[PDB]
Design a protein around this ligand. Sequence first.
Ligand SMILES: Nc1ncnc2c1ncn2[C@@H]1O[C@H](COP(=O)(O)OP(=O)(O)O)[C@@H](O)[C@H]1O
Ligand SMILES: Nc1ncnc2c1ncn2[C@@H]1O[C@H](COP(=O)(O)OP(=O)(O)O)[C@@H](O)[C@H]1O
Ligand SMILES: Nc1ncnc2c1ncn2[C@@H]1O[C@H](COP(=O)(O)OP(=O)(O)O)[C@@H](O)[C@H]1O
Ligand SMILES: [Mn+2]
Ligand SMILES: [Mn+2]
Ligand SMILES: [Mn+2]
Ligand SMILES: [Mn+2]
Ligand SMILES: [Mn+2]
Ligand SMILES: [Mn+2]
Lengths: 468, 468, 468
Amino acid sequence: SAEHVLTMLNEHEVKFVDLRFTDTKGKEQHVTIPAHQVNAEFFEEGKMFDGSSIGGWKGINESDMVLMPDASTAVIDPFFADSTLIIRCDILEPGTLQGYDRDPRSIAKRAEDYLRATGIADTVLFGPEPEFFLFDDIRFGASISGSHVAIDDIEGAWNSSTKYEGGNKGHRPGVKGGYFPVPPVDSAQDIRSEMCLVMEQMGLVVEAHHHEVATAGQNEVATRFNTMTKKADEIQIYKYVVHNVAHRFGKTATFMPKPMFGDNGSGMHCHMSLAKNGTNLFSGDKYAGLSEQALYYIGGVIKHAKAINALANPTTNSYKRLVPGYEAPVMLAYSARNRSASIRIPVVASPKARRIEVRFPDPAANPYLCFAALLMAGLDGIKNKIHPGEPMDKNLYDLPPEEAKEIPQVAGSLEEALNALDLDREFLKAGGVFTDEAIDAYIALRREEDDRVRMTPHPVEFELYYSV
Amino acid sequence: SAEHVLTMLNEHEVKFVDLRFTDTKGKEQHVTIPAHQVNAEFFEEGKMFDGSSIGGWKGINESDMVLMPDASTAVIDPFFADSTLIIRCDILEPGTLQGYDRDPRSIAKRAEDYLRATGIADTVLFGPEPEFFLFDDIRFGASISGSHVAIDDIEGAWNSSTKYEGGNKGHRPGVKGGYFPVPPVDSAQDIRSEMCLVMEQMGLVVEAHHHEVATAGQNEVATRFNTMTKKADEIQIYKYVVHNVAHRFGKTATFMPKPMFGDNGSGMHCHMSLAKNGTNLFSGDKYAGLSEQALYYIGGVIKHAKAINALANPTTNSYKRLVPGYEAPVMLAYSARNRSASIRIPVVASPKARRIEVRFPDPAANPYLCFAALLMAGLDGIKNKIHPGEPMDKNLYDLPPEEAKEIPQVAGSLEEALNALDLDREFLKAGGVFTDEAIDAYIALRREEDDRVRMTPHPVEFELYYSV
Amino acid sequence: SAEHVLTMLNEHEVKFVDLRFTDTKGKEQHVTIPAHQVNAEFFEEGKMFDGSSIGGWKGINESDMVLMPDASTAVIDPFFADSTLIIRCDILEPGTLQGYDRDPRSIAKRAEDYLRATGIADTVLFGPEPEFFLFDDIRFGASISGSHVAIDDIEGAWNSSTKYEGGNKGHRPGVKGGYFPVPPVDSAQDIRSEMCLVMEQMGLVVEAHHHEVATAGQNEVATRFNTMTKKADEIQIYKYVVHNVAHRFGKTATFMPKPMFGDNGSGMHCHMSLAKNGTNLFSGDKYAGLSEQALYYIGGVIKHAKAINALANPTTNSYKRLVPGYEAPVMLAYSARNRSASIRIPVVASPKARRIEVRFPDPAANPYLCFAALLMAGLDGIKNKIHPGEPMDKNLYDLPPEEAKEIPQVAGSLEEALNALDLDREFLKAGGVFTDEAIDAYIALRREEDDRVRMTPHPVEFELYYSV
Ligand SMILES: Nc1ncnc2c1ncn2[C@@H]1O[C@H](COP(=O)(O)OP(=O)(O)O)[C@@H](O)[C@H]1O
Ligand SMILES: Nc1ncnc2c1ncn2[C@@H]1O[C@H](COP(=O)(O)OP(=O)(O)O)[C@@H](O)[C@H]1O
Ligand SMILES: Nc1ncnc2c1ncn2[C@@H]1O[C@H](COP(=O)(O)OP(=O)(O)O)[C@@H](O)[C@H]1O
Ligand SMILES: [Mn+2]
Ligand SMILES: [Mn+2]
Ligand SMILES: [Mn+2]
Ligand SMILES: [Mn+2]
Ligand SMILES: [Mn+2]
Ligand SMILES: [Mn+2]
């Protein structure tokens, strides 16, 4: 409703409207217009902007594109000083007003459409669990003469020896020791709740909040699932709230997957399930309460895992979390117990809540593209009745080590994932959801990133080879 | 209305009246008088002041001149502590009360007059888009033993490694990475809006605001077009608001065109169109919805580009933005897509909004003189039916590089532009708008500036030649 | 003599041989081999080295080239710790052993050959007067956030206020006040003499040494002329001695033409004359004791001045010395008095010493290429009997200012000079001395340098336009 919006403008005495959207990498972008620029036209024809400015979008000749406000997304910004209303927008091709091939939100919408079209189900449910870190100081750089990164937080175990102005009060979570010590060891209760309250003021529904495993401020706010595209929207808002509440509290938050070697990384498990006319298409008589549809879905995810990685773990850093470790969600298998398996099956009573949990995604992932790729892989698993095989209930990557334990695994590097995405792109092009151009552009953006890391000497290389 | 003014004095309990005007370089100037000095005389005969004090104005013998308040410009100053009313003034020759040959506002008015006189149209529309930078620290100097410039801002990418008192919160726009990351990466939302609110309190109409491309605080406030002279007035107010809101927020703003090598410069694109009795003389059946009048106008701009440069890019620094780069608006051509072309043709639906966008101007330009020169070149393009030739839809300055790609280009240095202005002055003298004396004086002011830069050793020269 | 060399090896118990050569920019380069690697082969076939490593030389496919030792140049290095013999080398094309088109020494030799060939004379005489600066501290840099240059020397007038550890002894040359105050005002007597003694130990013949005009260590060592190519060799040695004696004394020397705005730059006047069978072809009955041949030579130099500039003033910095100043050697004219004229005619008694002094060259110039271009221009002046016109005995660039005083002048910027060289290249290609490829390569090297300076914001631009 465009009318609901015009009343929210008066009800909150809005002075500005902040138009938001996401780029290919997954980063929320914005531009602001005075409330008085919002008229009838605005909703039917949107506003014009330069495409060539966003990475991986229009090139030299076709710059101009359309910002189409989605009136359903209207929500007040809780941080800006002057009353302002946020309105998420889709990026449409001018004239045709179609929906840009490279617009991640359009792509996600297309994927929800294709779901309904195949008639396999009418709605997809996503419940991602993004984790994050809260620090006090983050410093880094790289130039010809070197490079570095320094992290600091009042909770960091390393500060047990630090001299502080008013004395070191020393109650800190040790390495891997953040799972639930009550305050003062946990220094983020008040902040986690503000994040919750604010998230809810912005339309999210919070289920829980807690400190995570790592020392130095790993935390998590769990929110209720929602339909795929609305959830990706929620992820963006979620990140926004986290980033800004942290900033307001004198901290700095990051959704990087592995900021520290030696302690937990941050993951973004994704719970999924399908539905039609209110019934859960994933409940059944098969394994752990699953439908055979769920199993085909799983099979799809497993078949296209490496390609999904390119979207669910889009950073070189992502692979520093996905390493032969014990709890590393790297084994392409399912189970209701074995937490070595990248696909957990939650054991729950109500068949209405039956679903699967794909564990390898990380918060760096573009909501839209990550969720979409997960769906398309699932659908292709169904359409082609791809059987999962049997569930792994044994053990992870280490011992096993019997048959060299070379069972399925997620990509081991970004390049590998990008290459998989290159080759295994058909399941994504299905229904015209992902175009080759979009995929090739995405890959090019990430290869440029992959190159920086591959080409820049690493501090550890000096430790290992300076005296060679 | 001089009566409207006398009521604004009582309504706002004004204690002072701040008389404003612009010098040849384009810098707003002012002098203040107590409100009680405002009487009937004031409006009909103005106030006297020393001409010899402003650069490039009256010399040794004819110092005294007149400040003529323009009652239509009355607006309250939003920063001064004591209630004060701003009134823009024109500079008139004493006795004759004509309008000083060297007064940029008089010159701009003369140009609007000449437009109506030729009967080509009755009003000119200007929609400039000045960009600017917001820093925290700016230091520079030059003496016999050296020189330097140091820029600093909390957003500067270089500060990713800086130690801060309360910790580095590190969410900064990388180089060329300022186009729209939401806060906290974008640290200027609150300030851009205050600038908007204040601009509107001062009569401007804001269309949008956003962070620009460069790291370290490049920003932009887009305002609605207006008739030529009123828009130049708006530019002055615009700059004033930007400069002062920044100052009040603990920042410092600059409209310099290229403060940093390696990242975006700041430009001031100028959208233009002509009109008569409410109809847009630029809409037609020709290319991209244009009238043949628009094309002649374009031809004029292209013919006199180098001379216009002397007013639209009046600083040596201006040419550090206009360099063989990809997006450099340096190719003297038009197109609706090719953003290599210094003249873009906005593709819009309503023929009421058809216009041209001359991209090479920068914010250092004198509003008045820059806009005027753009007009006069356009008119001369019409009067002499100067055809544009065909639109460039190929590519920019690099590859092309086929036929050495020596097509039209803007001046490559200030001196070159000044020289062009010298030789190609006829189109400006038309209608007696620009006098030779005015032009020669302007050129002399800028040559003195050009000399400082040409004569002072450049830091890079040491890098390049110290070991020669 | 290759035998004289083999005896110098034993006489001085040489452990190494330092092979030297010059690149296109004019910078001496070197590589060292143990004395035991010097055999008969060495002299007849030289040693192989990678061409692609030097700027502006061989490209992707034809890397390898020959270093041909010139046994006449053997001289002991006075600084190296272990006894080492320096041997200048020419760069020859492999197999053909011809002489690389781009080798500046080969080019200079070719030019001396062509002189003898035309039969105009059998030897060219060059007496350059390079000036230089001696500092204590030189700091500079340029990055995205700024740039700077800081000069410091115990003689700098600015240090009259500096606090020193053992007290400020304050006897310093004021600005433009360095011409001859005896010590202690002149702090470089001992160092200038060491430079002299060492220069002579290396084969140069010193005529005088003295402090120059500028504060902060401008100095000069005057050496006796010699035949063109041998003199360019001497220039290289000269610079080497200056640079290294300075280094050994705790100073740092520079041959940059204008390190400071506000005080003298450093020039390299070039005295020239031609000869055949021991007689001075420049003495005659014409003006000031000149032959008509000398006048044609002058005419040549004047005709091709702008192109010569590209070699005699090859840096952007060069043009900060050649600016409308009083003593600026920028007026393309001759005279025996008017020191406004870039060509002075020394008034001397013995007709054996009659010659011309071209004043605009600076020490940044490549010896070889600068001298060669001067010759070729002179010869073309002769071959085509280019008359000089009449001598200027009036005044310089300022008042005059009568007829706007637009008489001949040297290039006003590097680009202009490079462009002149581009267009006016025929006189250089004469005799196959300079090839188009060589010229185009040189121009490309310098344009890259010109670009750095044109594109990088200048500190003064902030002073002039930050508040725009
Ligand atoms: N179909 C579904 N029915 C019920 N809950 C679902 C469904 N699909 C996803 N979910 C999500 O399960 C997630 C919540 O619980 P959480 O305590 O964070 O689990 P875990 O211990 O695996 O991190 C939420 O995102 C929840 O909304
Ligand atoms: N004749 C005209 N009709 C409509 N708009 C015009 C006209 N002449 C100029 N304009 C100006 O176009 C400019 C605004 O839009 P903007 O989003 O900043 O474009 P761009 O993407 O080229 O920077 C304003 O200055 C607008 O008022
Ligand atoms: N043909 C020539 N006969 C005599 N001296 C010559 C000849 N050609 C060049 N010279 C040079 O004149 C220069 C020296 O004198 P100098 O005192 O430095 O003069 P100035 O006052 O012009 O700087 C030397 O380089 C000297 O050898
Ligand atoms: Mn968790
Ligand atoms: Mn989980
Ligand atoms: Mn802009
Ligand atoms: Mn624009
Ligand atoms: Mn001298
Ligand atoms: Mn001299």
